[model samples]
Target chain A: DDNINTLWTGVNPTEANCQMMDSSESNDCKLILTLVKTGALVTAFVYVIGVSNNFNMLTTYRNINFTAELFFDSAGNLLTSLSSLKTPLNHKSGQNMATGAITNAKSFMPSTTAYPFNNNSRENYIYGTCHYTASDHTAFPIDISVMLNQRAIRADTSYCIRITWSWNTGDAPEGQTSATTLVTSPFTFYYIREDD
Target chain B: DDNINTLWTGVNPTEANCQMMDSSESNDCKLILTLVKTGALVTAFVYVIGVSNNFNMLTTYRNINFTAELFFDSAGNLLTSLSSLKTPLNHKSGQNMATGAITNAKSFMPSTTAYPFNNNSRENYIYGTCHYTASDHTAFPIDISVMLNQRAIRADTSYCIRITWSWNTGDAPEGQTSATTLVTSPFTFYYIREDD
Candidate 1:
């Protein structure tokens, strides 16, 4: 094993065709994320979830952070981000927060060393990235994923998530003319659950 | 029957889709027309049937053309040419051009006094138009109605279709810096057999 370079193979969850769920009652449940573009620091938010086919219970929830360093090519320039496996979130559910509300301000609040809830525990942490190729950065897919806590214990429960990023223009001073050369693509995902 | 307030009710085709077919095994099939963007003109081509569509038999093809002058709202501009409507070919075993070719050009290019195709013959005429919303060009559901030989045929049998339009930028000078705008949203239609 030490002598041979083993190329591991597995299913790529990062490239999975993630989809959003629709809400029957209202549009109040929505996903929002901020995007930034630069040479080295490109930020993005990615969501992932898995559920049992028959039982319809969520097996996992992943909100990943990504950073990319872009390069130019003959066709155009591309901002390639870090793999989804690196960036992760220390997620705190709404029930655990001190204020008990998830707003834009509370989104970036630092996590305490102790777990938020005594009975409920955060189990999964995953990361992912999205690669957008467009000359004018405005029209890119808003990559999002979601699931419902449809178990008999937690009925009609939902979560709204947001992703924010900053750009890093290597060598070139931050907030320079070169910074304006890039564009950002922002999108949202709402995971909806329909009652059977 | 005296209902007349001078209301001009236009009978726009609700649905339109077409395909190119030919009898010849080697004839280079093409659909060419003029595109108008803000009262100026440009040449654009749409492939009703391409070399890969197998010109040997009666083939069915389909495509969607976006007629909306503008595909995006943030950018206030009109598209010169919308996208093309292309479909997978369904071939029947035959090589005769007479039975091989199907078109809607005749409906559009009447052998008589039509202003645009008056001199054009039955075998040489094709027809289609850009569909868009006058209020907001970015609105979806863009569609185009197509016909050949004055008759609407199924997608698999039609041969040769033309999409034509001249830009109508009311009261604007041609090619002026303020007048010249970029349009991205083009309206198009997809074709499928009504029987199928």
Candidate 2:
């Protein structure tokens, strides 16, 4: 009979592991990893580079959980930690200033639009963004990587990316670090720079 | 074009709500109500009252959100709060104690067998066979009630009963009245004894 009973049941079950920052709806495509913190530093930055034929679907999952891996090139070369990257400079938000002796500089512009590189032109380029607080610079060599799908990629479409980091988890002080879960809602891009 | 383009052209709006508890397939029936300090004594007790009608459904929902006016007896006397009921005195788990007051005062006895009054008896009497802690006694006039589906009760069935109490929210001195809420599952008799 359907008499509501309140007997001792089993423990609460765990929820599904959320996907990292890959947009494919397939559960087999997502991955999440934790990273250790490195020593203190003045400032650090992370960047992502990948090529994919399915440009429309590549940005499927943004706002994912990721650790900033240590400084590394495309071939995986460990660079100096945050403590070695110190050259203090003060800058306010929404301001542009170019200086320093480093050659071949890259852009640090923040935008609310999708990246133009993810179009039909090449179907390959870097997309997505990261957020960090001032205290986060202390950690270095975070563990960052692109989520993958065990299912076969679209015919002739290849996706490869590297996530390079400047600070680690513990490097950040209290009340720091962005708390955002990855979004895999099909074609949504978080913190876009240009509408595609 | 309607076969493909029209299907994907409409705006797919999404709506979400903040949930108190997850209502997944594996969720169970649960309730959580907070009790404040320094007010009227608040306590809850439950009884497994028998259903007069055989075809009646047992489970009923009362969404009365903490109002002053509630169900009262025909004599115009308000029902006693669950927190006011006396906790079983000197009660121990898994022990069957006979009622010393009356020879037929066996309804309050804890049962070793299944529900519906383990023994063949139907007499209206109050006995305490269960035990509660000292802290639950501070508040007078506790609220008590029962929760059982109609199907679980026969003409002479004894349902499960529970006694719950609450004093104060935080760590305060002795100034607040305790509150309680209790329920009795179906087919279980709680025999009342003079010396529980």
Number of the top-ranking candidate, with TM-score as the measure: 1
Question: Deviation in angstroms for B176 in model 1?
Answer: 49
Question: Considering chain A alone, what is the TM-score of candidate 2?
Answer: 0.19
Per-prediction CA RMSD (Å): 24.7, 27.4
For each candidate, what is the lDDT?
0.21, 0.21
- Candidate 1: list runs displaced more than 4 Å: A1-120, A125-128, A131-175, A181-183, A186-190, A194-196, B1-82, B86-196
Interface quality of candidate 1 as DockQ: 0.01
Candidates' interface RMSDs, in order?
25.7, 32.2
For model 1, residues A100-179, the per-residue Cα lDDT tens digits are: 22123221221122212122444322222222222332222223222112111222112212233322322222122212
Q: What is the interface RMSD of candidate 2, in Å?
A: 32.2
How does residue B104 of candidate 1 score in lDDT?
A: 21
User: In terms of docking quality, how is candidate 1 classified?
Assistant: incorrect
